[PDB]
Design a protein around this nucleic acid. Structure first.
Lengths: 46, 121, 116, 212
RNA sequence: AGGGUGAAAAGAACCCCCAUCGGGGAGUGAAAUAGAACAUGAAACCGUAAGCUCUCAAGCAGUGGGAGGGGGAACC
RNA sequence: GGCCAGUGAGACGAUGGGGGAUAAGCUUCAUCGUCGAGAGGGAAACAGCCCGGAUCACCAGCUAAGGCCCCUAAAUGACC
RNA sequence: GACAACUCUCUCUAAGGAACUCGGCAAAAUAGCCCCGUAACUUCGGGAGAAGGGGUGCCCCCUCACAAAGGGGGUCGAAGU
RNA sequence: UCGGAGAGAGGCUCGGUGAAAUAGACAUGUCUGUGAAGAUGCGGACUACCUGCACCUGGACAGAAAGACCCUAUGAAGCU
RNA sequence: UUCACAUCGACGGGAAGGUUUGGCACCUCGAUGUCGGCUCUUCGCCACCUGGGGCUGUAGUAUGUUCCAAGGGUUGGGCUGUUCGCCCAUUAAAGCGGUACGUGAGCUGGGUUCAGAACGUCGUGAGACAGUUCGGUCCAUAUCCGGUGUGGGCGUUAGAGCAUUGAGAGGACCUUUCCCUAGUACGAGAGGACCGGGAAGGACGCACCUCUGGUGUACCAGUUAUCGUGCCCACGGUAAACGCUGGGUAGCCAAGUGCGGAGCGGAUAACUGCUGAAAGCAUCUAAGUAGUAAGCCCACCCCAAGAUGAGUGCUCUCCUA
RNA sequence: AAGGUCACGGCGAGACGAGCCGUUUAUCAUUACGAUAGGUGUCAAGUGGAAGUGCAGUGAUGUAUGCAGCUGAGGCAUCCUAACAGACCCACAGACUUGAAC
């Protein structure tokens, strides 16, 4: 239940990178929502 | 659906009045005994003048059972009272008169049982 | 497993989920717009459509149905005494789910209901 | 390899067929959205084995890619969503061009084995995937329904692989064998196939005679 | 437990982003990448950029040999 | 002799023995070896077996114990 | 938001009813007010609410105090504290 | 017996705030063999793209408290 | 009965095992948490039962023993905290073991090694007994290896869609009773054939909702108390999730239903052989060949080209810079 | 570019990624394909006789209108509502050797 030994810098950088990157993928979605919200026919955002 | 600790009635006048089922015979399943099988019933209490007394392990048949009962035609008979009939392992009962209906299919194995019923159905 | 079950249920227990749908539809039929999280939008969609059609047939019995569902008393009388003109021959599909930006604080998807 | 070419239908509910003898038998009901047509045949020389590629569920061209429609087009057939081939003992006598087949055949081969994607039950636990048992529910017990032990002490030093952990249960196709065909109706092009066959009504259902 | 802007507050007029938090110019000062959680500023630890390199791998991870490449044109 | 230490239950191997059951990687003593305090090569790995004793440098050579089909050096060399 | 497994707080579970288990532990089950009856023992106080059995919802009616309760009749549900 | 379905709170995913004990460094395979005689760290063979998330707990002689059982100390203390 | 070896084998001898009781005391006292149950393994055989065989003091039916055989199987209870310690009822049989006397970072704590108390006994006494007796909070949000699932990048050398062979790996090939053979063979009779067919089961495994049902907090209906909708009627709320109850479609389940363990074919082990010398007889073997086991391999069923040995082919996609 | 991914509508798919099917003039027409979710209309199915009014009853309560009424995550029909707007990744012929045929 209790960890044996601290992880390296190596591994941790790997996972933090996966975290942030997991944030990377979820921008270009918001950028599509932006580039579509620039005035255009649509039924959303009253 | 007779576990090995059920109280059955009896369907005859052999002398028993109810009787615990012990560990059915034949089908190696024994976690479930249904119509047409045999069980090792130890008498529970009996009419007190009978040659089947308090706690005499004996072998008997199941003739009525509250669980459903499939058929071929697609009907399902289900009584309300789990019942047995004390048996010998070479045929006939040892109670002469039989109470209540039975199932006709057990005829093809228990002919003498069925002949003595008042309702073969 | 869900398989087959199609009762949209919200984050809430049974009783409170009922109450949320009744209050929330009341306030729709009151204002015409509304802002609820998307899930509540769907769950509304069903019931408010039921009330509309329940007003499309203004007999007493039905009027007492609706009188029993909706909280606010007079929104009902206004409603069934008003709509079989509005929704004459619209024939089902009464709402509209024009959606909108999420909710700062949860980033909870948030939508915005109409009646049309 | 399979005994003969087969078809693929669709599960359509179940029912009972009262046999005129007066016995009750359950059945399912197989249906074809669109008819099975051969769309290929591969030899032992040109390709590595022998098989015929049938297709099912004709669909609009849009629904379907360019490589597909080209593959379908080359053989001169209609579109079709599903597409599978029966590898067949290398005796193929089929023109890969739209030999629309039929059930003139399964009524003779009165035992059919079908291949169906079962239904899917998510991430089921130990007690249900593998038919485990469970600890006592009372008597101070504190581990119900949990997977219990895993292995031995220091020596095995780990968990033998292929251990029966929990995991995803359904969703992979399964056979069902020596399942017998039963009175069929060609006007409705429906099959009344006894038994119970993988899948809630509406999934593709391969269907091919036995491999006894 | 909590010390050390500057020699002198000369501690930042004015402008812009501006919920007046915090900043970029302008100005002061020799210097403010000395600007007020401000004097030298090490190591652990957190990033950034450039050079070469790891996805059939096996290792107290260094060492002797050095393929290939990058550097100022034999040494790293 | 002076000035001063550390050490005080060693281990195994060979031999002669006691105890044990001529059992123990057991225990106990006597005479030697290695380890302890000692590297290196053979033993696949492997304190206590074999050769051997490390001041350093050498991209020089001859051998000991052991070895010469491949992984690893060296005859898949001779004849009985 | 979704609604995996699994732990907990809970409801139900066909047929059997302790077979589970160290032990029916933990659940479930009785239960209120009237009315009948209440044993072995005993220090003769107790046991004893022993045990066990029955009715009880609403309407109508007159009596017994004639405040309650009881008697008669009816109606309803599967189930009447 | 012999499980099963269900509601709630957690678990799960997304937005916000954000600990912990442990921690030589870990680039942290399986079987056998060896070895202070029960090794991911040595030898031989097999096996294994890199790296996530959920889930279980057999190992890392896993964490916790310089054992509380046993013994010792010309230890301490209580009682007779 | 005679007959050493069908069977038991006195007297003595030679081994393998490593699990009982032990001997040493080598690791571990800055800690390696004990007995027995639950759940889940997996492995060994010297084999209890199912498959085949000799020999039998085997007429048959039972056997007794050995031989190859671990693929499978190896009940439910009563008593005790207590694995052949045991009676009951079966059953084909109801094995012995290893896995830190498997498994407490998975569970219980009945026992033992805590503080209370008492009985017998020892001690004048405090107290004590590997004697007994009643009570006595067994802690945990996985870093890593391991395992079950599922993904993403990247490799597959242009880039992609489908279909796919399959090296490898996995699950399953299990087992009883009846009937025909046939009361036949065999037997003085009692009894009563394993050569092959046919059915019913059993455990198990994969599924499915047609039926029977469980739950179904979507739903309908009865109803208790109370508050609200002005009021009567009709409703709504409330009673650890819905007050308590009846009924229930779908879903998921089972005590329900459907199916499944195969013509299988190839090598074999024990064993029986065929031809046949070494050895001018013989011998299953030395040459060569035949039969034959639930055991091995393929077949069956499910994955599977990350099989970096990265396969296959029929379609697509663009050569303007 | 072929193909994707995202987005949008959801599922007999699912812990999240996955999967799978949609994504509107959502045909029109002479025998199958273009209804994805909702709503609506109808039918299976469940429960079981609604409300109001009338009649019979002094009153509980019954009775007729009436397999009605509330149900309608299942079946088809229906574009009424929503699949609008988009956005993004993806490229230019796939280095080096000989062999062979014209």
């Amino acid at each position: 239940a209790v960890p044996k030994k601290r992880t390296s810098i190596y591994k941790k950088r790997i996972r933090k990178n996966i975290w942030k990157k997991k944030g990377y993928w979820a921008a270009l979605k918001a950028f599509s929502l932006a580039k579509s919200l620039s005035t255009g026919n649509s039924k959303s955002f009253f | 659906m007779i576990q090995p600790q059920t109280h059955l009635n009896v369907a005859d006048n052999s002398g028993a009045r109810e009787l615990m089922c012990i560990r059915i015979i034949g089908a190696s399943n024994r976690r479930y005994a249904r119509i047409g099988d045999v069980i090792v019933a130890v008498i529970k209490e009996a009419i007190p003048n009978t040659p089947l007394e308090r706690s005499e392990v004996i072998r008997a048949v199941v003739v009525r059972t509250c669980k459903e009962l499939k058929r071929d035609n697609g009907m399902i008979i289900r009584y309300d009272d789990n019942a047995a009939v004390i048996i010998d392992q070479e045929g006939n009962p040892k109670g002469t008169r039989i109470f209540g209906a039975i199932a006709r299919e057990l005829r093809q194995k228990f002919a003498k049982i069925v002949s003595l019923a008042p309702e073969v159905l | 497993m869900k398989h087959g079950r199609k009762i949209h249920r919200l984050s809430r227990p049974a009783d409170q989920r009922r109450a949320l749908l009744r209050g929330l539809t009341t306030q729709l039929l009151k204002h015409g717009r509304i802002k609820t999280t998307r899930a509540k939008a769907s769950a509304m969609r069903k019931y408010v459509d039921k009330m509309i059609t329940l007003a499309k047939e203004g007999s007493l019995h039905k009027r007492r149905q609706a009188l029993g569902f909706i909280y606010e008393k007079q929104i009902v009388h206004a409603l069934f005494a008003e709509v079989p003109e509005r929704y004459g021959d619209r024939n089902g599909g009464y709402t509209r789910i024009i959606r909108t930006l999420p909710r700062r604080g949860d980033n909870a998807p948030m939508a915005y209901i109409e009646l049309v | 390899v399979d005994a003969g070419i087969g078809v693929m239908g669709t599960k359509l509910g179940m029912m009972s067929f009262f046999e005129e003898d007066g016995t009750v038998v359950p059945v399912t009901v197989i249906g074809f959205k669109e008819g099975n047509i051969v769309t290929q045949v591969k030899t032992e020389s040109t390709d590595g084995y022998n098989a015929v590629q049938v297709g099912y569920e004709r669909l609009r061209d849009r629904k379907l890619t360019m490589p597909e429609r080209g593959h379908l087009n080359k053989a001169g057939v209609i579109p079709m969503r599903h597409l599978q081939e029966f590898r067949l003992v290398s005796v193929d006598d089929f023109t890969p061009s739209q030999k629309l087949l039929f059930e003139e055949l399964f009524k003779e081969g009165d035992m059919v084995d079908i291949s169906g994607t079962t239904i899917g039950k998510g991430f089921q636990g130990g007690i249900k995937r593998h038919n485990f048992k469970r600890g006592l529910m009372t008597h101070g017990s504190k581990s119900h329904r949990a997977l219990g032990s895993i292995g031995a002490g220091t020596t095995p030093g780990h968990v033998y692989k292929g251990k029966k952990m929990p995991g995803r249960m359904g969703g992979t196709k399964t056979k069902i064998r020596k399942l017998k065909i039963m009175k069929i109706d060609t006007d409705l092009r429906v099959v009344m196939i006894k038994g119970a066959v993988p899948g809630k009504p509406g999934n593709l259902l391969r269907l091919a005679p036995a491999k006894i």
